[PDB]
Amino acid sequence: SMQEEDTFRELRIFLRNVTHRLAIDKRFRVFTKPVDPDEVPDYVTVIKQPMDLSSVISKIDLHKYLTVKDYLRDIDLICSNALEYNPDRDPGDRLIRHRACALRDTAYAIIKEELDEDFEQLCEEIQESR
Ligand SMILES: Nc1cccc(-c2nnc(-c3ccccc3)[nH]2)c1
Ligand SMILES: [Cl-]
Ligand SMILES: [Cl-]
Numbered sequence: 758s759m760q761e762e763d764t765f766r767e768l769r770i771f772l773r774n775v776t777h778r779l780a781i782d783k784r785f786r787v788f789t790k791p792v793d794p795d796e797v798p799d800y801v802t803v804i805k806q807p808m809d810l811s812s813v814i815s816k817i818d819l820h821k822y823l824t825v826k827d828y829l830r831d832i833d834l835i836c837s838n839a840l841e842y843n844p845d846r847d848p849g850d851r852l853i854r855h856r857a858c859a860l861r862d863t864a865y866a867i868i869k870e871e872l873d874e875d876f877e878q879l880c881e882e883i884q885e886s887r
Contacts, residue, residue, distance in 0.1 A: 761883050765823060768880055772817050772828050775867050780810045782863070784856050788835055804842055808834040823884040825868060825877045836861035 780789050791809045792800040801807065808831050822828045839857035843850035 764876075764879060764883060765820065767876075768822065768825070769817050769820070771872070772822060772825070773814065775864060775871075776810055776813050776817065778867065779860060779864060780814075785810065785860050787853065787856065788839070788860055800842070804838050806834060806838070808838060810835070823887075824880045825872055826881070829864065829868070832861055832864045 779785055789810045791807055791812060792804075794801055813828070813831050813835075816822060816831065817828075822831075836857040839853055843853045
């Protein structure tokens with residue numbers, strides 16, 4: 758219905774705003790673009806499901822997220838990919854992991870403070886009906 762389309766549009770607007778706040782945070786610059794395969798050529802073969810904030814924005818616009826839970830699964834994937842690609846004790850890896858965890862924690866904290874659970878529940882119940 759019209760009212761359901763309005764609901765998903767509000768969800769997209771909400772998710773774009775949250776993603777934008779993540780993307781302008783200097784800590785998260787490394788997660789704003791997909792990995793360049795001329796800098797780490799083996800990235801695309803190790804990491805089977807690359808995810809980054811540019812891709813998340815593209816998926817919002819393609820109406821791929823019908824719930825906040827769907828969105829957070831991709832934020833979680835940005836984080837978990839980073840933990841797996843950079844597992845070592847050296848400072849470069851530890852810095853990336855810390856930023857990845859912070860990205861994840863920041864998204865969840867924004868959602869906890871700013872998302873009405875009844876709005877999420879509505880999105881879920883529409884998504885289950887289609
Ligand atoms: N999940 C995700 C999304 C975008 C980038 C990355 C990433 N993981 N590790 C790197 C990296 C590794 C060595 C030097 C600089 C960045 N970048 C990981
Ligand atoms: Cl840096
Ligand atoms: Cl190590």
